[PDB]
Design a binder for this molecule. Structure first.
Ligand SMILES: CC(C)(C)S(=O)(=O)C[C@H](C1CC1)N1C(=O)[C@](C)(Cc2ccc(C(=O)O)cn2)O[C@H](c2cccc(Cl)c2)[C@H]1c1ccc(Cl)cc1
Length: 99
């Protein structure tokens, strides 16, 4: 129910957040059953989502294409690198309240 990364301080990935309605629906579409999460939890579910709807079928280039997927609207970008973790958190932050 969680994924952490070496690029973000360990404590930041425990930050408690309430996803805004769109982020929440994405989380809930892949099993999430609550409204309040830690950032590492959100990242886990977003990761699941990204892979259920095949937004990242090509693993060897580390790009998630999402221009015409909900994730694209959530992030407001057509695509992004899965290696650029700070940016991902940045984009996620916009779509939630920090408890
Ligand atoms: C199945 C896995 C391997 C458990 S996963 O982590 O859920 C897979 C997804 C994949 C859809 C893009 N994903 C990743 O593959 C990679 C890049 C795999 C990875 C994890 C850790 C480290 C490290 O600590 O150095 C390096 N690489 O991680 C993406 C990730 C994970 C946690 C936070 C962020 Cl911001 C990104 C992470 C990811 C990227 C984007 C989002 Cl929105 C969510 C998760």
């Amino acid at each position: 129910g969680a994924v952490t990364t070496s690029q973000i301080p360990a404590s930041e990935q425990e930050t408690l957040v309430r996803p805004k309605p769109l982020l929440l629906k994405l989380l809930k579409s892949v099993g999430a059953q609550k409204d309040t999460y830690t950032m590492k939890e959100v990242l886990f579910y977003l990761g699941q989502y990204i892979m259920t709807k095949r937004l990242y079928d090509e693993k060897q280039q580390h790009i998630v294409y999402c221009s015409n997927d909900l994730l694209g609207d959530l992030f407001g970008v057509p695509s992004f690198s899965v290696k650029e973790h700070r940016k991902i958190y940045t984009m996620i932050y916009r779509n939630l309240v920090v408890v």
